[PDB]
């Protein structure tokens, strides 16, 4: 399999786009994708101890390459990062600007009041 730069094995049926170039996934990310597919055999939280930037590139790769299992774990991780955080801490972690007016923000609060926690 080709990188964006320039790397081949039999585990490759795990990606459903594959089922030989891959121009949208970089060499660093492809090495990690292959690593995940090898481990998923017949005889994980650790693999997911990476920086935020690499995580988002891996989500992008898992989507593009159509690896259902990889997209799930990788997206579940992001959800776990959101959990237990105030709106300001969510913003900080993910570098989000607050685009709400105070009135919109009050509308969101008033709506949230209609569900039990």
């Amino acid at each position: 399999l080709k990188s964006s730069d320039g790397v081949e094995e039999a585990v490759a049926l795990e990606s459903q786009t594959i089922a030989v170039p891959l121009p949208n996934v970089t060499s660093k990310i492809l090495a990690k994708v292959i690593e995940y597919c090898k481990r998923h055999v017949e005889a994980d939280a650790d693999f997911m101890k990476i920086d935020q930037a690499t995580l988002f590139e891996l989500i992008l790769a898992a989507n593009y390459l159509n690896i259902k299992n990889l997209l799930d774990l990788t997206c579940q991780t992001v959800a776990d990062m959101i959990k237990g955080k105030t709106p300001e801490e969510i913003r900080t972690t993910f570098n989000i600007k607050n685009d709400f007016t105070p009135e919109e923000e009050e509308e969101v609060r008033r709506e949230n009041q209609w569900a039990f926690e």
């Binding site: 709106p87 509308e107 709506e111 926690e117």
Partner: protein
């Protein structure tokens, strides 16, 4: 040579294609986190609303505050809607019965608005005082409504005809497959009339729960027989039955075989005997040869509960039949089965032969021994959960050897009212899994005379007047990941605690992450003195976040003034549920507790007091 990056304008999470953001949000199940996410920015608000899969409605949907919410308040993917907790708790929701032309178009309006916020509902829970609630609430969802759960702790309206409570569902909801009446008080005749006179609806049903608020004496043979016969497609049945053979209409061998034969597709079957008072060793009309035939008719069975007061004798051959004829059996709960595993030296027998078991719970087995536990440990290598209740011949050495032998696999243990198993000795017995056990359920019995590394959940049973304090000395002194505790008090007030002694709730203060408590005093019986006793020191549980409190039981169950005062000092509480009532205005809790959000008086016991008029 890398240089460190500065302040960036781009956000990786927001630069993802929007579908991938929805996908992320779909994994976030903490509701407070979901609400917080929606407050982060406009894009996450859209993602949260587009992906919320379940919601329990908070507040009064009859109020203008709900009806005049923006159309942005919309959950297009939401499958499960729970309306059973709407305020005021347990009142008629969209009933036609007057508490005339106004009520009709006001009902139509609320329903339409609910369908507007929740277009895609396939599962509904609703507090259901009379059938017109269902008539007004299902036209918007009748095409897609697959699971319905009804809640009623109040008296059945006495003028209704038999089966009228279920009619609106069975006439209108062609997609209905699952009917949950576990918390729905009605007569057993209601269920029989509705379910034997609607074959269109009834032939499609796959799941049926018939607990009926745990307020009946059980379905009879003449009731269970017709119900089963009308539901050929049942895959899950949960029901209380009359098993007492002093009554000629009890469930025995014939009624059991007839259930299996009418419902051959069952995978989950949970039958239990409603417990009064005093049956100890009196025999059931269920025999071993009867169960052999029974299990042979249920080849798809995976999950089997038969929880009896009345005894089934010499049951080992029936257990061997279960293992052979139901090769997928995994989850097994038995009450008052005798001879479950004899444990001869040369072979495995009875329940020890059920090699596929993942969970095993045994109540009132009088001849279950340490030898039996040795065989079960050798035979049942996949056991993740193990329980024993009232098994008076099992010792700490039986438990210890089981715990050691099943070390790779055993995560959840129950030991309740076993005569030879007091608390300290039982905690020591669990040493081989001290660092692995996730959940523990025990009764507390004291002797006057390694952290629990993975213990997330603890359930404790006590007699009235008994102290919690010695639990720390008994072996549960260090529990770093213990987040939920359930305390239940049994017995009567025939022992007064010495003056200035308290139950010892403040002795849980040394558990660093204990966030959730269930304190159930409903079966515990001056009532204020007893509440003082049990609640004193609750304020010192620094991380206490959610509290379920059941006051002692006179048809109203009222919190006394010191009970209110002690709960009002729990400054960390986010959630407060009182299963009973209070003379105090609900706002005094919100004012005392700075971040209290969810508070409700849930009178979820039969019969619930009627408080209907303004």
């Amino acid at each position: 040579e890398e240089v460190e990056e500065g302040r960036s304008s781009s956000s990786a999470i927001l630069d993802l294609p929007e579908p991938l953001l929805l996908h992320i949000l779909s994994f976030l199940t903490d509701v407070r986190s979901r609400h917080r996410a929606a407050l982060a920015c406009g894009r996450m608000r859209a993602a949260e609303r587009a992906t919320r899969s379940e919601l329990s409605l908070r507040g009064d949907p009859r109020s203008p505050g709900f009806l005049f919410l923006s159309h942005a308040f919309r959950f297009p993917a939401l499958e499960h809607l729970d309306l059973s907790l709407v305020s005021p708790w347990g009142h008629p929701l969209l009933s036609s019965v007057p508490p005339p032309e106004a009520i009709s178009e006001q009902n139509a309006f609320i329903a339409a608005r609910l369908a507007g916020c929740f277009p895609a509902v396939t599962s509904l829970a609703v507090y259901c005082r009379d059938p017109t609630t269902l008539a007004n609430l299902t036209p918007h969802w009748q095409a897609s409504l697959r699971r319905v759960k009804l809640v009623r702790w109040h008296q059945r309206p006495p003028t209704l005809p038999d089966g009228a409570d279920l009619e609106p569902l069975l006439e209108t909801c062609a997609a209905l497959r699952e009917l949950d009446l576990s918390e729905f008080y009605c007569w057993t005749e209601d269920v029989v009339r509705a379910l034997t006179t609607h074959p269109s609806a009834t032939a499609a049903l796959t799941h049926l729960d018939l607990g009926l608020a745990a307020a009946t004496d059980g379905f009879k043979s003449s009731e269970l027989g017709p119900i089963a016969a009308s539901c050929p497609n049942l895959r899950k049945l949960v029901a209380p039955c009359l098993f007492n053979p002093r009554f000629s209409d009890c469930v025995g061998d014939d009624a059991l075989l007839s259930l299996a034969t009418s419902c051959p597709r069952l995978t989950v079957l949970r039958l239990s005997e409603p417990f009064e008072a005093n049956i100890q060793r009196e025999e059931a009309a269920i025999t071993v040869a009867g169960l052999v035939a029974f299990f042979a008719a249920l080849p798809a069975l995976e999950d089997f509960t038969m929880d009896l007061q009345h005894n089934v004798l010499e049951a080992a051959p029936a257990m061997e039949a279960l293992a052979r004829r139901c090769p997928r059996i995994k989850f097994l709960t038995l009450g008052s089965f005798q001879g479950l595993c004899k444990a001869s030296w040369l072979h495995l027998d009875g329940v020890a032969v059920c090699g596929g078991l993942e969970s095993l719970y045994m109540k009132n087995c009088q001849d279950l021994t340490d030898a039996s536990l040795a065989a079960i440990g050798r035979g049942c290598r996949r056991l993740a959960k193990f329980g024993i209740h009232g098994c008076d011949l099992v010792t700490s050495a039986g438990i210890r050897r089981l715990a050691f032998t099943l070390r790779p696999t055993l995560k959840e243990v129950t030991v309740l009212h076993c005569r030879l198993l007091h608390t300290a000795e039982c905690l020591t017995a669990l040493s081989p899994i001290r660092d692995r056990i996730e959940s523990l359920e025990i009764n507390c019995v004291w002797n006057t005379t390694g952290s629990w590394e993975m213990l997330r959940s603890l359930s404790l049973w006590f007699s009235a007047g008994q102290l919690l304090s010695p639990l720390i000395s008994a072996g549960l002194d260090s529990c770093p990941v213990l987040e939920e505790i359930s305390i239940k008090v049994e017995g009567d007030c025939r022992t007064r605690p010495a003056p200035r002694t308290i139950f010892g709730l403040s002795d849980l203060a040394g558990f660093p992450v204990l966030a959730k408590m269930k304190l159930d005093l409903s079966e515990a019986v001056d009532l204020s003195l007893w509440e003082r006793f049990y609640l004193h020191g609750i304020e010192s549980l620094q991380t206490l976040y959610e509290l379920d409190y059941w006051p002692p039981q006179v048809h109203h169950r009222s919190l006394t003034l010191p009970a209110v005062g002690l709960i009002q000092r729990c400054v960390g509480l986010r959630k407060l549920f009182i299963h009973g009532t209070t003379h105090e205005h609900f706002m005094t809790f919100f004012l005392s507790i700075p971040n209290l959000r969810d508070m409700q008086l849930r009178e979820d016991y039969y019969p619930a007091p009627e408080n209907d008029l303004m």
